[PDB]
């Protein structure tokens, strides 16, 4: 029985390029987390308490997703490499513009998973593609969700009354099409 790079018993070696891609994706999701935290604060600063609560929970969820990836590296007996975290964006001209960044950030998160996925397929790492499958499924749901929130906010067309109504929807947990 051989030892993996993190010292645990090694079930199967992992391509170093694939390892680097996973460690980088963990950074993407940690960055999405602090980005949602920044968005939470921006919303709280404008008394959009429902949006604040939503993004506060989104920040904690994204962090969980990131930690889920660190557990997989442990499971594969690979080293983690927790990297420097950039500062998030913190300024937006409007809720609509913030929601656009939020959607793009979710779509970008999926793109990063897809990049890892293609690398695992190139290396025939079926453990990794199986590991990623439900995470892609969750990304589809999050993309559907953020397109719903973005589109609903754009439908409001900057009217505060409509934004207050949507804000209260979010505070109540009404956050997707259902």
- In angstroms, give the least distance from the CB of 114 to its own copies: 5
* Separation CA 36–CA 178 (nearest Å): 22
- CB-CB contact of 25 with 113 (8 Å): yes
Is 62 annotated as a binding-site member?
Answer: yes
- In angstroms, give the least distance from the CB of 65 to its own copies: 13
Nearest to residue 76, comparing CAs of 130, 148, 137? 130
- CB-CB contact of 96 with 39 (8 Å): no
- For residues 83-103, b (16+ Cβ closer than 10 Å) or e, as one string? eeeeebeeebeebbebbbbbb
From its own copies, Cl ion, none, which one binds at residue 146 (CB under 5 to 8 Å depending on kind)?
its own copies
- Within 20-49, the residues that bind its own copies by CB under 8 A are 34, 37-38, 41, 44-47, 49
Return the number of the residue (18 or 99) whose C-beta is nearest Cl ion.
99
Which residues of the chain form contacts with Cl ion (CB under 5 A)? 94-96, 158
Q: Residues 6 or more apart from 32 whose CB is under 8 A from it?
A: 62, 105, 106, 108, 109
- Gaps in the chain (C–N > 2.5 Å) come after which residues? none
Contact pattern for its own copies over residues 74 through 113, marking x by CB under 8 A: xxxx--xxxxxxxxx-x---------x--xx-xx--xx--
From Cl ion, its own copies, none, which one binds at residue 17 (CB under 5 to 8 Å depending on kind)?
none
Of positions 8, 20, 94, 173, contacts its own copies by CB under 8 A: 8
**HSE-CB for 140 with a 13 A CA cutoff:** 6
- In angstroms, give the least distance from the CB of 102 to its own copies: 10
- Tokens at 6, concatenated: 């993190």
Return the number of the residue (17 or 47) whose C-beta is nearest its own copies.
47
Of positions 36, 54, 92, 146, contacts its own copies by CB under 8 A: 146
- List residues forming the annotated binding site for Fe(3+): 29, 62, 65, 106, 133
Report the binding-site residues.
29, 62, 65, 106, 133
């Amino acid at each position: 029985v051989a030892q993996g790079p993190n010292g645990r018993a090694l079930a199967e070696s992992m391509n170093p390029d694939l390892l680097s891609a996973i460690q980088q994706h963990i950074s993407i999701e940690r960055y999405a987390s602090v980005t949602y935290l920044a968005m939470s604060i921006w919303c709280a600063e404008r008394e959009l308490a429902g949006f604040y609560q939503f993004f506060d929970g989104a920040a904690k969820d994204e962090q969980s997703h990131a930690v889920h990836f660190t557990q997989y590296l442990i499971a594969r007996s690979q080293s983690n490499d927790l990297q420097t975290l950039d500062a998030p964006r913190q300024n937006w001209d409007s809720l609509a513009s913030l929601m656009a960044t939020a959607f793009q950030m979710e779509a970008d998160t999926t793109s990063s998973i897809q990049s890892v996925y293609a690398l695992a397929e190139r290396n025939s790492d079926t453990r990794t593609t199986v590991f990623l499958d439900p995470l892609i499924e969750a990304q589809i749901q999050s993309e559907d969700q953020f397109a719903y929130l973005l589109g609903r906010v754009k439908f409001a067309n900057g009217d505060p009354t409509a934004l207050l109504v949507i804000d209260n929807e979010l505070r109540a947990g009404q956050t997707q099409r259902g």
